[PDB]
Design brief:
guanyl-nucleotide exchange factor activity (chain A); alpha/beta; 14% strand; unfolded protein binding (chain A); homodimer; 11 helices; Rossmann fold; 8-stranded mixed sheet; binds adenosine-5'-diphosphate; globular; zinc (chain A); binds zinc ion
Chain lengths: 313, 319
């Protein structure tokens, strides 16, 4: 398998791509890069990079101001960003898992469709800059979670007397109707997010123990949801050997370790697209630098020859 | 009054008997164990110390440059510090395997198999694994006739070594529902509780966490402190290892590192604001590996007297 995201960046079948990665690994940068890279290689289509981080990371990343309303990235023709707070814009929430996530997510699916209605321009693909916390998409399990719970009720409600059942008189069947109407919304989405050719998740990690462990946990969690996981980007690698030996033993030391774990990553995820990305000089901000960086998601970086490219950054 | 940023009062203590040292990730769990152990022993010549490990990798041996095993052995060059590396899970299998042999052809709490509920009731495996450890210790204290005044536990790299602290309350809950095996369960729930009486006393036993100043280690560390609180174990000291005070301008020729430092600092301030009440001891990143009694003790020194990146620079660069 090829050490890059070329086939995805190039894909004409995907409509929903997720980009996650806990810890300060490069989740946002990778989102933008994937987004830019895809947009640039398919001028014919339209792209939407949406975030949820209240911190307004996409704004800080590109050097522009985005909000609840889609706005093309200054300098691009088909890449638009959108930063929303789903939580900001019914209380079994603190009892049944995935109910708040399912609702919070549906809220996102609405700001998108409505933005597609006003600008009359529908997005061909949406790159999801997953929120830095919680479990954004546990809701994929809501359907099976509700089926089991509305079977506990049917087991008790059928094994009792008219008295007991007709005794409890709650304003909960206004609930009975909306839990099934939701259990339907989720499942229609699940038929989408569960199709390998339609949506995939891209993990981001640094080459260190805690991040490999954390990203391993993520892949497990994503499999349990039936979400497709086939690509992981190992960011902030510092190929210190090819580094024209800029001295510093402290770094040569770090590199030896990253290499030790790249080997594990390599042996543990042989079937995945394990993309190696260089550690740049400073922050990677603005469309220009983001583009220059994003290029190595498509054609694997060469620490020997492409060195001169990330040092002009 | 500020809580000193060091382990002086612990290393100095004459009240503690059980000290645990944990830290997931390659943060410095082993090195800190050795250091705490050495520093304690050096500060209290009058007493005897045992640094036990469970890591099958024999980390204490690789750490000191000697060979330790199931039998305590004083650290060459020390008078009151002895190490021992054992595999409690292994010895628990050899003990169980043979209990099954003596069942067919018929820790007394093994007759047949009290260990089958292991994959059912949480803490049973750990409670047994741990008692196995308390045995090799008492046994070693019986033969060499010299009992240890304090044991530093180099927690094992994985699992949940001391979840068993919950076993008592977990069995009482189960014993009420289900109300041979029943005699072994209670005989166990008594062993654990007499231990909790010990491990639950702040003046008798404490746990010291180890972490590097990065996001995942801080949260991992938080996770641990929560877990240890849930067990009623004392947690008052966190060792933030591998810090590189890059600002010292000494060899600061590197920017890449200056970058790393800015980050560590970012989290040191969180660790400092989140654990104000704790003893948050800052340890320097050395040049290379810290191995052997000599370098291990030179380093360990900064667990007692907080390190000074300006003054003490000359000390960590001789290693
Ligand atoms: N590979 C890299 N090399 C150099 N700098 C990077 C790299 N990746 C990210 N950065 C910089 O570090 C910061 C890390 O945050 P970011 O990329 O947004 O990830 P996350 O979503 O985890 O916060 C960014 O502001 C960016 O400018
Ligand atoms: N502060 C430090 N400076 C330089 N090297 C260190 C430091 N702390 C630990 N090391 C070295 O890093 C490696 C990490 O392993 P170790 O210290 O045994 O911890 P752990 O039990 O978490 O693996 C060892 O080779 C160790 O000697
Ligand atoms: Zn450096």
């Amino acid at each position: 398998v090829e050490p890059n995201l070329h086939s995805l960046i190039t894909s004409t079948t995907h409509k929903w791509i997720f980009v996650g990665g806990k810890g300060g690994v490069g989740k946002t940068t990778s989102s933008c890069s994937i987004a830019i890279q895809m947009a640039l290689s398919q001028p014919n289509k339209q792209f939407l990079l949406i975030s949820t981080d209240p911190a307004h990371n996409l704004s800080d990343a590109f050097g522009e101001k985005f909000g609840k309303d889609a706005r093309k990235v200054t300098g691009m023709n088909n890449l638009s960003c959108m930063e929303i707070d789903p939580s900001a814009a019914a209380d079994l929430t603190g009892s049944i898992p995935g109910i708040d996530e399912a609702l919070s997510f549906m809220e996102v699916m609405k700001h998108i469709k409505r933005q597609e209605q006003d600008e009359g321009e529908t997005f061909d693909t949406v790159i999801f800059d997953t929120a830095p916390t919680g479990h954004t998409l546990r809701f994929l399990q809501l359907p099976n979670t509700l089926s089991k719970l509305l079977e506990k009720f049917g087991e008790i409600t059928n094994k009792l007397g008219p008295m007991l059942n007709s005794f409890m008189g709650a304003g909960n069947v206004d609930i009975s109707g909306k839990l099934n109407e939701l259990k339907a919304n989720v499942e229609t989405i699940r038929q989408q997010f569960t199709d390998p050719d339609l949506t995939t998740f891209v993990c981001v990690c640094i080459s260190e123990f805690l991040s490999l462990y954390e990203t391993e946990r993520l892949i497990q969690e994503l499999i349990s949801y039936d979400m497709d996981v086939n690509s992981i980007i190992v960011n902030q690698l510092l190929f210190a050997e090819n580094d024209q030996e800029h001295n510093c033993k402290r770094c040569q030391a770090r590199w030896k370790m990253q290499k030790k774990y790249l080997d594990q990553i390599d042996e543990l995820y042989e079937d995945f697209h394990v993309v190696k990305m260089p550690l740049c000089a400073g922050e990677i901000r603005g469309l220009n630098n983001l583009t220059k960086f994003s290029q190595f998601l498509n054609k694997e970086y060469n620490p020997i020859t492409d060195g001169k490219v990330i040092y002009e950054l």
